[PDB]
């Protein structure tokens, strides 16, 4: 109907090809299994949406500041600086993002391959929110911290709702979603210790600063969560859990007598209740 | 029948024969390959049924049998542990592995010494008993 | 699964009145520190403190 | 009589009585069959663990 003024206004043009989504949606009469076509429609517009984001991200590749994004410039563009579109966070264009994501519905009903392309599809557009927010979060300054800190636990508690989302998900998305907010450590954590690949949990800490002593000390925080021997199923693993742990039980366990005992007659002390323990 | 009964003894005589002398490896892989105690816990009920099969001239040595297994079994134990770190070179790994299947080979013959319906002697139970809580 | 009269072998075995302790070796108190530890661990696993008590929430 | 104790119960602790095992492709008879190999099963290791625990003590 015309363009040159919904350009100006582009954004618009994303929320309601969503609510047209939606009242498709309403009568895509995905009950169950039996739709198909119906769940083919609401992939076609997921896909225009994201590779939308894609362009905006691209487009922040190509730079001309030879302090911002060095490569792109007179510097090699063999490497592109961060994905991120340096988008501010729009509070009706994120909205719509965390809206598509709870279209995380067809795939509850949809054939195999589909499931998946959907899933990487809304992996890629959450890979583009938390690098708007990671740019945006940058860029504050020493004062004001109070509101900077705030900000801080509201993209954390949204990587952590991003997290829930992708727990029943394929988890070889996992650590693409975990390198992309380059930290967010809680869900990929979680998802080498659900699994037996702690393999996965040495690697993670190989490629991370002080990889010892955050992985204690997270070990300690998640007391019978993860580290446990028992949560585990054979030999040497069961037997290590024991030893993350940092009383007497556990200390008899490990080998350490002398701290053991130690303990115990810490224990022994301070019993006033009953003569015969 | 007569004749699987004496070549099973005359075997069974270079199985002492290696076990006295104190070739233990070589006494070990003669009664493995003899199938006559079991050496995993899931071959305990098979052995348990062959055993009914079993001449009593077989039957009567199987006391002694546990016996110089178990005390193999031991030995090898024994020779694991007393194996001091200072060999530079051998990952930790294969001889926690190796521990866990002598206890689990010991296990097995316990298990098999209780399971057959035969009344080896009360100081046999015992020793065996004995030789396990030694390697636990 | 006695798994606390286990660990009362401890206090018998230190008694006095038998001086038990005195006819053990090196190798089987090492060994018996040992069983212990994994009636010990097996009390843990059962949700009771190390000593077979109820861990006090 | 301490090691006549321990050989009586070390004996009765390694003949538990056997689960019934199903075969896959059981007639109605080997079902019904079945059922009543469990409920004997569960009366007979009822009596197994309880004649383990007087030994034990």
């Not at chain 1, 727990?167 to 954590?189: H, M, P, R, T």
């Not at chain 2, 070549?7 to 069974?12: E, K």
């Not at chain 3, 206090?11 to 006095?16: A, G, L, T, W």
Request: glycine share 4%; charged share 25%.
């Amino acid at each position: 109907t015309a363009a040159d003024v919904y350009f100006r206004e582009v954004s618009q043009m994303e929320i309601i090809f969503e609510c047209l989504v939606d009242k498709e949606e309403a009568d895509l009469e995905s009950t169950s299994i039996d739709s198909v076509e119906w769940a083919n429609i609401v992939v076609n517009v997921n896909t225009i949406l994201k590779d939308m984001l894609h362009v905006a991200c691209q487009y922040r590749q190509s730079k001309n500041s030879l302090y911002k994004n060095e490569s792109g410039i007179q510097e090699p563009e063999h490497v592109p600086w961060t994905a991120s579109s340096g988008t501010a966070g729009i509070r009706s264009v994120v909205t719509r993002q965390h809206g598509i994501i709870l279209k995380v519905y067809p795939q509850a009903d949809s054939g195999l391959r589909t499931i998946l392309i959907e899933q990487l599809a809304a992996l890629l557009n959450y890979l583009l929110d938390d690098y708007v927010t990671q740019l945006k979060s940058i860029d504050k300054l020493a004062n004001e911290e109070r509101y900077n800190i705030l900000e801080m636990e509201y993209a954390q508690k949204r990587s952590e709702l991003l997290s829930p989302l992708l727990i029943l998900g394929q988890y070889a998305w996992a650590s693409n979603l975990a390198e992309k907010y380059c930290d967010f450590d809680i869900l990929v954590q979680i998802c080498e210790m659900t699994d037996n690949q702690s393999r996965l949990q040495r690697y993670m800490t190989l490629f991370a600063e002080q990889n010892f002593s955050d992985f204690l000390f997270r070990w300690y925080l998640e007391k019978g969560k993860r580290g446990k021997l028992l949560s585990q199923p054979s030999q040497h693993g069961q037997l290590a859990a024991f030893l993350q742990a940092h009383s007497w039980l556990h200390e008899l366990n490990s080998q350490e007598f002398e701290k053991a005992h130690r303990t115990l007659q810490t224990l022994a002390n301070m019993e006033t209740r009953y003569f015969c323990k | 029948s007569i004749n699987s009964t004496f070549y099973l003894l005359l075997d069974l005589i270079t199985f002492f024969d290696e076990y006295h002398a104190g070739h233990i490896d070589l006494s070990f892989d003669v009664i493995e390959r003899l199938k006559l105690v079991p050496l995993s816990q899931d071959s305990v009920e098979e052995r348990v049924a062959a055993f009914r099969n079993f001449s009593d001239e077989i039957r009567h040595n199987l006391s002694e049998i546990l016996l110089a297994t178990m005390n193999i079994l031991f030995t090898q134990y024994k020779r694991l542990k007393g194996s001091g770190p200072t060999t530079l070179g051998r990952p930790q790994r294969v001889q926690e592995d190796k521990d866990s299947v002598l206890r689990s080979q010991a296990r097995a013959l316990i298990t098999f010494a209780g399971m057959i319906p035969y009344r080896m002697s009360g100081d046999t139970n015992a020793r065996l008993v004995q030789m396990e809580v030694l390697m636990n | 699964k006695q798994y606390k009269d286990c660990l009362r072998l401890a206090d018998i075995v230190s008694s006095e009145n038998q001086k038990l302790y005195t006819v053990f070796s090196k190798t089987e108190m090492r060994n018996l520190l040992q069983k212990l530890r994994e009636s010990s661990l097996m009390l843990l696993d059962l949700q009771l403190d190390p000593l077979g008590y109820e861990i006090q929430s | 009589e301490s090691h006549e104790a321990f050989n009586e119960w070390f004996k009765h602790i390694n003949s538990p009585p056997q689960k019934p095992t199903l075969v896959g492709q059981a007639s109605f008879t080997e079902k019904v069959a079945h059922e009543h190999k469990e409920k004997k099963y569960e009366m007979d290791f009822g009596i197994w663990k309880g004649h383990l625990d007087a030994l034990t003590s």
